[PDB]
Amino acid sequence: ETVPVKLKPGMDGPKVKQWPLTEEKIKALVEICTEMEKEGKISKIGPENPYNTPVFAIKKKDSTKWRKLVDFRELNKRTQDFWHPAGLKKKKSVTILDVGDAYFSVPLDEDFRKYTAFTIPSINNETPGIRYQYNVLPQGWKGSPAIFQSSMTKILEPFRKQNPDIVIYQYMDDLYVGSDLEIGQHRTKIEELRQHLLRWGLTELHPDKWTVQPIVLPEKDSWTVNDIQKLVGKLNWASQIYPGIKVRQLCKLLRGTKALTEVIPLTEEAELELAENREILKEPVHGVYYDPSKDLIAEIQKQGQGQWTYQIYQEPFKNLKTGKYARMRGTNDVKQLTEAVQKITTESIVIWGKTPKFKLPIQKETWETWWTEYWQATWIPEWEFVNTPPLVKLWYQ
Amino acid sequence: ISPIETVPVKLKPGMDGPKVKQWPLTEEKIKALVEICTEMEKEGKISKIGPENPYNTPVFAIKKWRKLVDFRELNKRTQDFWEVQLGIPHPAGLKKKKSVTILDVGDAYFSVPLDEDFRKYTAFTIPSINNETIRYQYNVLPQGWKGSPAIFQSSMTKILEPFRKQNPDIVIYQYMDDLYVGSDLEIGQHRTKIEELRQHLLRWGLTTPDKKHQKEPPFLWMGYELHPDKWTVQPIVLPEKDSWTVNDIQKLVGKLNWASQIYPGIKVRQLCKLLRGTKALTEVIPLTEEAELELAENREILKEPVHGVYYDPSKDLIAEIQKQGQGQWTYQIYQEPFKNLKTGKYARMRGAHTNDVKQLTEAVQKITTESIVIWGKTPKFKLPIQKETWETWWTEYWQATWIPEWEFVNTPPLVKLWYQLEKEPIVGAETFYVDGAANRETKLGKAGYVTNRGRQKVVTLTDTTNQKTELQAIYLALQDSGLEVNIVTDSQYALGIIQAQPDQSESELVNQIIEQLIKKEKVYLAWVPAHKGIGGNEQVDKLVSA
Numbered sequence A: 001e002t003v004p005v006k007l008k009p010g011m012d013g014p015k016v017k018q019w020p021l022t023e024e025k026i027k028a029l030v031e032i033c034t035e036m037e038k039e040g041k042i043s044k045i046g047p048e049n050p051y052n053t054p055v056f057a058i059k060k061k062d063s064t065k066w067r068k069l070v071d072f073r074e075l076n077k078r079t080q081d082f083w084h085p086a087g088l089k090k091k092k093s094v095t096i097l098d099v100g101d102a103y104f105s106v107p108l109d110e111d112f113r114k115y116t117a118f119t120i121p122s123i124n125n126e127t128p129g130i131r132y133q134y135n136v137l138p139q140g141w142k143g144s145p146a147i148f149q150s151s152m153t154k155i156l157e158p159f160r161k162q163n164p165d166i167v168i169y170q171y172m173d174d175l176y177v178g179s180d181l182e183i184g185q186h187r188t189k190i191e192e193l194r195q196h197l198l199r200w201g202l203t204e205l206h207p208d209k210w211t212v213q214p215i216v217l218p219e220k221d222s223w224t225v226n227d228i229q230k231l232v233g234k235l236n237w238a239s240q241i242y243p244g245i246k247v248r249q250l251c252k253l254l255r256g257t258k259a260l261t262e263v264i265p266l267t268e269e270a271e272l273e274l275a276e277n278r279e280i281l282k283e284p285v286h287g288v289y290y291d292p293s294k295d296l297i298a299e300i301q302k303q304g305q306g307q308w309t310y311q312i313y314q315e316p317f318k319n320l321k322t323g324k325y326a327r328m329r330g331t332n333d334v335k336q337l338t339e340a341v342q343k344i345t346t347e348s349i350v351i352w353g354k355t356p357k358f359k360l361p362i363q364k365e366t367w368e369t370w371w372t373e374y375w376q377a378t379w380i381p382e383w384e385f386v387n388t389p390p391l392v393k394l395w396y397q
Numbered sequence B: 001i002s003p004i005e006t007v008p009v010k011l012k013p014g015m016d017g018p019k020v021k022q023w024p025l026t027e028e029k030i031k032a033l034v035e036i037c038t039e040m041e042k043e044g045k046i047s048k049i050g051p052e053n054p055y056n057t058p059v060f061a062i063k064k065w066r067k068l069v070d071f072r073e074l075n076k077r078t079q080d081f082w083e084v085q086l087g088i089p090h091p092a093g094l095k096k097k098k099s100v101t102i103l104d105v106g107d108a109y110f111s112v113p114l115d116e117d118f119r120k121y122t123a124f125t126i127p128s129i130n131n132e133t134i135r136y137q138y139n140v141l142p143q144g145w146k147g148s149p150a151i152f153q154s155s156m157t158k159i160l161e162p163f164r165k166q167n168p169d170i171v172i173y174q175y176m177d178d179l180y181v182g183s184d185l186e187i188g189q190h191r192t193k194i195e196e197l198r199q200h201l202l203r204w205g206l207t208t209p210d211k212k213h214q215k216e217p218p219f220l221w222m223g224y225e226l227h228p229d230k231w232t233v234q235p236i237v238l239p240e241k242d243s244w245t246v247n248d249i250q251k252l253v254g255k256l257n258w259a260s261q262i263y264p265g266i267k268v269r270q271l272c273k274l275l276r277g278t279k280a281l282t283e284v285i286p287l288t289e290e291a292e293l294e295l296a297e298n299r300e301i302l303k304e305p306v307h308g309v310y311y312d313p314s315k316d317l318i319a320e321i322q323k324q325g326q327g328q329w330t331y332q333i334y335q336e337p338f339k340n341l342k343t344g345k346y347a348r349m350r351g352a353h354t355n356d357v358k359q360l361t362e363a364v365q366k367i368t369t370e371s372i373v374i375w376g377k378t379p380k381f382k383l384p385i386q387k388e389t390w391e392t393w394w395t396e397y398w399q400a401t402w403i404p405e406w407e408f409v410n411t412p413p414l415v416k417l418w419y420q421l422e423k424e425p426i427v428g429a430e431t432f433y434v435d436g437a438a439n440r441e442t443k444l445g446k447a448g449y450v451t452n453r454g455r456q457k458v459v460t461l462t463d464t465t466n467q468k469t470e471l472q473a474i475y476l477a478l479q480d481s482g483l484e485v486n487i488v489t490d491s492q493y494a495l496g497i498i499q500a501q502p503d504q505s506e507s508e509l510v511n512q513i514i515e516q517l518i519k520k521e522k523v524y525l526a527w528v529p530a531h532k533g534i535g536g537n538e539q540v541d542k543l544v545s546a
């Protein structure tokens, strides 16, 4: 059986070029692909198939063996459309599972295969690339999870009737399961699900912890002109989100062309102004509601010393969530940045069940040379490169 | 000819290739084509058609006579195929062999069968003075058709496939109608393998030159001389004329530019000067004295021979870099001291605002990607920078930046941080509150400042903007100021640019500031929002708006 799939009207197959790969990787591909070839998963293609999609190799979490990874972003975006339990987000713990394996079992409408074409490069172009196209449902294709939904639910009902207290959500090649249970029973019971899943062909987050973090203002024994200026700056910005924020009293303390280091005693009025503002900030600005008809946006700023702040939002200054990320043991802005995006995407997946478009503070060249080297998810969000304003950073500190 | 499974071809969806009429030719050609064609007709190449064919491409006859056909039309209505790798092997990434033969198949396209189904579409015609009636169509890949290259290579790849699995000690390169074959076998063994190869191909209909007709090493490659164990940089000759047109000069530069990578010390600054304001390619420009000079110095340099070794997978790849001037970098990649695999030069990237550390970072990113392609590896770098400076730069810069494994090399001129901004205000140091503004309809602007010690100054500008004026103020401040300053501005723009400590730019203005900046002994720059009752700022806000 094969449900015919089609590209969005008037759209044509992807013709994305293959970035170069490390020796190590390439080999693993050649290795992996001969395997999938023998098993029929994929077949070699000719010069008449002009389409092409990028592929690479990764090692998810603690693994010596490589995993083939194909970047179907363009294909997905060109594939027709097909067709979220808030419960998920509101859980104690949530676990992710990799059901990509499941897709192999299903054949792909032969008429669509051509588009799935890809290439195993060679060093120094010394060799003609190894061209392939899938014969089954490929992992990463927005279309796979879909055509597989039917069989998915089936295999799921059981665990969903046995344990109708947990929530199982599927995104691409991932399965998200959440239970307010306790860990011991959680790590052991999840096992129960992978057991049930295993008799077919397959093989630790805390949502109640994600929110819109509070802006904190500096408190100091004494205040210099400089100190006060920087304060007013932050406050002034913050007034865009909280029009309740006032700076009159403080501005006054400044009236005059004094030295920058001059110490200024605060007025009872100014101290009130601060008091009042501190309070206006003890909570996230009212009326911030997520909109599904709109795109999620995740902005990240580099704070230095391995720290990174980020905000998820659809409309400017109306954050749905804001956060920070410290650094993973083992001096690499790119590993950190990559790790961050993955964290923020997963987190975005949980809550709204969709990936955010990233605005990365890095140069295209830099990011493209290495991100694939620390990537570890089965999915890939969208991203663009920017230049962090000097301000935006001081503010989220 | 050849018996390989033909490739399924189809015309771009919808499109179809109907008719570009025939170009009536003289009688000497109408028959000089009638001849050559009867030929191919027998060889099976072309097939006398007409039964049912509305399509047609025009034939031409060029000075021997020889025939040419215009599929120019046919092509644009032909589906697109999988591109012919235009990414190509660079000498520096080859593994030394004991021998390397080259087999020029020559007559190939005409050996590979055409997708029968599609042949009709190839129909073309031969004139006849009195047009009283010659219709043909190709049965094999047509010399000039869109898909001939892809369709051929692919067949090629399929024909070697066995052979290679059978002969892993042998290595084959397919380029155009060419095949480079090298190995580690002995002089006779290889010879014999070639022969095997040769006939194997004929077992498939692909003719190739024998041993007493094949070309001999070294082989010319995108500028190099390839010997199976080493390569030499083709000698580069520069003409000596009394007549140097613009054209002559450009091409020279073009040539010298290429040599800039292999050869050390090449210059074109003064030759380049000679094009300034040129009115025509055919124009003649007398070479200045300095020109007649570097050109000579370049000839001396160009005589030197550049020898090079290949890649040994059992040795470290190492890339060392040098700062040959601002924005200008030189690099050499070797495995054994002085035995270079590859060398190159990256020219001054002249943008809005950077610095060496940043520049160095991109140079490094560039070599890495080059390397991942050439060798599928990343060299261990040796950079003219101290881990401390890099540690200072990254640890404090706003953008994700990375440098793969590397090692400091104390080979000046070193890349450093020309200046650093204080992290806190400076005590006793004067304090300049600067500002500037410009109208959105006159582009008339005012820039100036007001400071604690009473000192001040305003100035008028014409044809400027908000950002140019704001910068202007900071400059003034940096001038009428002592060796330690505190500067407070309201321009997020000015700030950011400076917050990133630039040391090179294409703005005369910025450059000047930079200079000023490097001069000072202690600088702290600060920012305060625009139009508020913020001391000092509300003051200048009054002077730059009168």
Ligand SMILES: Cc1ccnc2c1NC(=O)c1cccnc1N2C1CC1
Pocket: A126, B089, B094, B095, B096, B097, B100, B171, B172, B173, B180, B181, B182, B183, B219, B221, B226, B227, B228, B229, B310
């Ligand atoms: C032009 C070219 C491109 C790619 N590889 C090669 C060649 N030609 C050679 O002569 C050559 C020289 C040294 C090592 N490999 C070489 N060969 C390989 C085939 C033995």
